[PDB]
Amino acid sequence: GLFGVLAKVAAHGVGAIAEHF
């Protein structure tokens, strides 16, 4: 069930987060 929802987060980068710093 969540096996497909968790992976989505693992495929995400650090674009907006980088701008936060």
CSV table of N, CA, C and O in Angstrom, one decimal:
chain,number,residue,atom,x,y,z
A,1,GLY,N,0.8,-1.2,0.0
A,1,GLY,CA,0.0,0.0,0.0
A,1,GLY,C,0.8,1.3,0.0
A,1,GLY,O,0.8,2.1,-0.9
A,2,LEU,N,1.7,1.4,1.0
A,2,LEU,CA,2.5,2.6,1.2
A,2,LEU,C,3.8,2.4,0.4
A,2,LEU,O,4.6,3.3,0.2
A,3,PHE,N,4.1,1.1,0.0
A,3,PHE,CA,5.3,0.8,-0.7
A,3,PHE,C,5.5,1.7,-1.9
A,3,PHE,O,6.6,1.9,-2.3
A,4,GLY,N,4.4,2.1,-2.5
A,4,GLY,CA,4.4,3.0,-3.6
A,4,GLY,C,4.4,4.5,-3.3
A,4,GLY,O,4.8,5.3,-4.1
A,5,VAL,N,4.1,4.8,-2.1
A,5,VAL,CA,4.0,6.2,-1.6
A,5,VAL,C,5.3,6.6,-1.0
A,5,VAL,O,5.8,7.7,-1.1
A,6,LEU,N,6.0,5.6,-0.3
A,6,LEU,CA,7.3,5.9,0.3
A,6,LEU,C,8.4,6.1,-0.7
A,6,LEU,O,9.2,7.1,-0.6
A,7,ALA,N,8.4,5.3,-1.7
A,7,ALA,CA,9.4,5.4,-2.8
A,7,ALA,C,9.4,6.7,-3.5
A,7,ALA,O,10.4,7.3,-3.8
A,8,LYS,N,8.2,7.3,-3.6
A,8,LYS,CA,8.0,8.6,-4.2
A,8,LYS,C,8.9,9.7,-3.5
A,8,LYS,O,9.4,10.6,-4.1
A,9,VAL,N,9.0,9.5,-2.2
A,9,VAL,CA,9.7,10.4,-1.3
A,9,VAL,C,11.2,10.2,-1.5
A,9,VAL,O,12.0,11.1,-1.4
A,10,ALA,N,11.6,8.9,-1.8
A,10,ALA,CA,13.0,8.6,-1.9
A,10,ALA,C,13.5,9.0,-3.3
A,10,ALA,O,14.7,9.1,-3.5
A,11,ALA,N,12.6,9.3,-4.2
A,11,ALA,CA,13.0,9.7,-5.6
A,11,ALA,C,13.0,11.3,-5.6
A,11,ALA,O,13.5,11.8,-6.6
A,12,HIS,N,12.6,11.9,-4.6
A,12,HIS,CA,12.6,13.4,-4.5
A,12,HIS,C,14.0,13.9,-4.1
A,12,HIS,O,14.8,13.2,-3.5
A,13,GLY,N,14.4,15.3,-4.7
A,13,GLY,CA,15.7,15.9,-4.5
A,13,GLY,C,15.9,16.9,-3.4
A,13,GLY,O,15.3,16.7,-2.3
A,14,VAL,N,16.7,17.9,-3.7
A,14,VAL,CA,16.9,19.0,-2.7
A,14,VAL,C,17.0,20.3,-3.4
A,14,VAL,O,18.0,21.0,-3.3
A,15,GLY,N,16.0,20.7,-4.2
A,15,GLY,CA,16.0,21.9,-4.9
A,15,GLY,C,15.5,23.1,-4.0
A,15,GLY,O,16.2,24.0,-3.7
A,16,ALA,N,14.2,23.1,-3.7
A,16,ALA,CA,13.6,24.1,-2.9
A,16,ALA,C,14.2,24.2,-1.5
A,16,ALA,O,14.5,25.2,-1.0
A,17,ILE,N,14.6,23.0,-1.0
A,17,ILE,CA,15.2,22.9,0.3
A,17,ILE,C,16.5,23.7,0.3
A,17,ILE,O,16.9,24.4,1.3
A,18,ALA,N,17.3,23.5,-0.7
A,18,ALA,CA,18.6,24.2,-0.9
A,18,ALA,C,18.4,25.7,-0.8
A,18,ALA,O,19.3,26.4,-0.2
A,19,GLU,N,17.4,26.2,-1.5
A,19,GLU,CA,17.2,27.6,-1.5
A,19,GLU,C,16.8,28.1,-0.1
A,19,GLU,O,16.9,29.3,0.2
A,20,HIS,N,16.3,27.2,0.7
A,20,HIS,CA,15.9,27.6,2.1
A,20,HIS,C,17.1,28.0,2.9
A,20,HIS,O,17.0,28.8,3.9
A,21,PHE,N,18.2,27.4,2.6
A,21,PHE,CA,19.5,27.7,3.4
A,21,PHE,C,20.1,29.0,2.8
A,21,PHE,O,20.9,29.6,3.5
